[PDB]
Amino acid sequence: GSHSMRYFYTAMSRPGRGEPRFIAVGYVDDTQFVRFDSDAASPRMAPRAPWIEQEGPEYWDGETRNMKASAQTYRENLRIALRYYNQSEAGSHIIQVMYGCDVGPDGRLLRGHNQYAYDGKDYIALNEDLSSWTAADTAAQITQRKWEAARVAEQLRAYLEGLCVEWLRRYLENGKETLQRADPPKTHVTHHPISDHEATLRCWALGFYPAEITLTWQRDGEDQTQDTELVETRPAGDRTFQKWAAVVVPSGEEQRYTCHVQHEGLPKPLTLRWEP
């Protein structure tokens, strides 16, 4: 169905311990496919998925050149941010970047993204029109003024509507075996007494891709959102993801509880109960 390409940059200063570290990673959907780390013995854009390995040396040299250039720019931006926020040169600070494109089944641009953070807070973001900016504070407004003057938005629009979509489509075809395969969750319900009158029902989802999933408990057909313990979806390490949802139920009332599982890999939503 729909797909996304995302790049994530992290630039972290470390006064007294050398120049700021720059790490870049690239994703198609929930699959990482490239990385760059300025702290590597030999910094370069490197493959992290099998289907990207077929890209030639001009790809890898070009991307490596770009990441080294980007690293230098974001080291500059870290110095600039200190000024904008009247901060001392003694502290460690972080700039983060996430950008990319979303496409529909036909591979047409759904929307683009280009957003920035400073010390974990929104800094500036390209609006959905890909032509204007939202600045989070008066510091970012300075950046906005600079970027409006230099017409940065137009250049980002050109990338997001062009190369981003084009290369995402290329990656999707080259990695169709995996990127265009949904693995449905393997599911089951576990039961563990807490006491003489209460028990935990835990609904498990395992081995699924992509990460997007909905696990819900119902009691007598009504959602138990507030009484459900829901862990964050977590990576298994083999491309797939895991998740569970638990509720505490009165003993003898277990069969009034149903777990409901929604996932792209499933032809229809699943309903599961504990099976003693």
């Binding site: 870049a24 991307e63 250039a69 500059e76 190369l163």
Partner: peptide, 9 residues
Amino acid sequence: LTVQVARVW
């Protein structure tokens, strides 16, 4: 493919 130039703040 990454965007080709980073912007100065």
